[PDB]
Every structure is written in structure tokens, then in C-alpha cells.
Amino acid sequence: VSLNFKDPEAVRALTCTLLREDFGLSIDIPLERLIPTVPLRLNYIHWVEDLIGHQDSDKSTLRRGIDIGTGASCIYPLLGATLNGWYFLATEVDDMCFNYAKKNVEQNNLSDLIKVVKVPQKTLLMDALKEESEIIYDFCMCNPPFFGITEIMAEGGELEFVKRIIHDSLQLKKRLRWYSCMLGKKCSLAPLKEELRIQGVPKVTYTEFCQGRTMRWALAWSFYD
Numbered sequence: 156v157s158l159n160f161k162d163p164e165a166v167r168a169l170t171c172t173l174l175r176e177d178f179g180l181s182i183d184i185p186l187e188r189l190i191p192t193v194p195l196r197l198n199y200i201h202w203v204e205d206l207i208g209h210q211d212s213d214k215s216t217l218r219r220g221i222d223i224g225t226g227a228s229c230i231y232p233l234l235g236a237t238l239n240g241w242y243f244l245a246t247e248v249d250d251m252c253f254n255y256a257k258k259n260v261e262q263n264n265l266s267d268l269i270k271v272v273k274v275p276q277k278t279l280l281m282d283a284l285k286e287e288s289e290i291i292y293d294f295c296m297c298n299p300p301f302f303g304i305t306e307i308m309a310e311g312g313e314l315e316f317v318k319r320i321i322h323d324s325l326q327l328k329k330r331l332r333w334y335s336c337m338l339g340k341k342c343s344l345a346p347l348k349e350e351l352r353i354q355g356v357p358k359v360t361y362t363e364f365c366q367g368r369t370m371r372w373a374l375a376w377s378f379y380d
């Protein structure tokens with residue numbers, strides 16, 4: 156395995172070795188798809204913890220969340236379910252990621268806590284949660300996809316993705332307690348904040364995740380007063 160951390164073979168080896176050593180999670184992921192890095196994925200898991208609230212022992216419940224675009228790694232549910240005993244609905248549109256995510260759930264014996272679903276690509280939350288009338292989800296989380304010489308247009312597409320989540324949230328309302336998404340540039344934040352302000356979303360928060368050279372923002376919102 157390469158010693159140079161610019162090489163994806165080295166990043167993948169480090170991520171997979173970290174997950175085994177610290178958590179006892181063994182994952183298999185293809186170099187064809189985004190290789191998650193663990194420290195940033197953990198920051199977000201902990202931020203979800205802060206958002207959904209600490210429970211006294213007498214009102215402990217199974218926490219339930221939705222990870223939109225779960226990846227080949229199925230990283231956020233594996234971590235959420237392993238650290239915290241959270242249940243996840245985890246969605247994917249990509250066949251290769253779906254196959255891999257399922258395999259990673261099974262191989263870490265977590266099929267009881269994580270349900271991986273392949274949705275259709277024009278769908279987001281509303282189709283996955285349609286005629287759910289029995290429980291309220293505590294959260295959704297999302298690390299969004301980036302959809303000539305200038306696909307930094309790809310990076311800009313994160314805005315339209317989040318707006319779709321905002322769109323679904325406006326109909327689902329209190330069916331989930333906290334909607335959230337990680338953002339790739341701090342200049343995605345101001346327009347999204349203004350979009351929630353003008354739709355009258357009552358509760359909005361945000362935070363920073365820093366891993367050395369790399370900086371991410373996450374935004375979250377709720378229709379609960």
C-alpha cells in the first residue's frame with residue numbers, strides 16, 4: 156500500500172484500518188466511489204447527537220434517522236448504529252453503492268439497525284417516507300452528491316440538492332425532528348439560510364467541521380417550536 160496520502164489506495168487503507176481498530180467495523184469499498192474519511196464523518200454524527208438531545212435513562216428510546224445517499228461505505232449508519240445504537244433508513248440511487256452498502260451492513264451484523272434501500276433518482280425523502288404514520292424520525296443527515304473545463308459547476312450543484320431537501324421538509328414538516336445536510340463551501344450557507352428564512356422555517360442552526368486542511372459546514376432546521 157502507498158505511503159503517500161494523496162493516493163486513494165492509501166486513504167482507503169487508512170479509513171478501513173481506522174474503522175477496524177477503533178470500532179471493530181470491517182468494510183469493503185471500491186476505489187470507484189467516494190472513500191470517506193472517518194474524523195469528519197464522526198464530527199457530523201456527534202453534531203446529530205447534540206441536535207436530537209440527551210435522554211434520561213427512564214425515557215431512553217430507539218433513535219431513528221435517515222441517511223440520504225449512504226455511499227458504498229454506508230459510513231454514517233455504521234458509525235451511528237455502532238457508537239449510539241441508532242436505527243437508520245439509508246438510501247442510495249447508485250447500484251454499485253447500494254450493493255456495497257448492503258454487504259457492509261450484513262458483514263458487520265447490523266441488519267437489525269440499518270435498512271438500506273435503493274430509491275428512484277427523482278426521489279428524496281418524500282418517496283421514502285410516504286404513508287409513514289407510525290413514528291417520527293429524529294433526524295436526517297446527508298453528505299450531498301456533486302452533480303467543459305469548468306465542472307466546479309459540480310460543486311455548485313450542492314445548492315440545488317440541499318434546496319430539494321428543503322422542498323421535501325416543507326411538506327413533511329414534523330414527521331422528522333431535525334433535517335440536516337453537510338455543505339462543501341461556506342458560500343453555500345447564506346442562500347440556504349435565506350431560503351429557510353423566507354419559507355418561515357422556525358428553527359435553523361449551523362456549525363463547522365474542521366479536519367486539518369479541509370473544512371465543511373453543516374446546516375440543520377426544524378419545524379418544532
Ligand SMILES: Nc1ncnc2c1ncn2[C@@H]1O[C@H](CSCC[C@H](N)C(=O)O)[C@@H](O)[C@H]1O
Binds near residue numbers: 230274
Ligand atoms: N436522490 C438521491 N437519493 C439517495 N441517494 C442519492 C440521491 N442522489 C445522489 N445520491 C447518492 O448520494 C451519495 C453522495 S456521496 C456521500 C456518500 C457517503 N454518505 C459518505 O459520506 O461518504 C452518492 O453515493 C449518490 O449515489
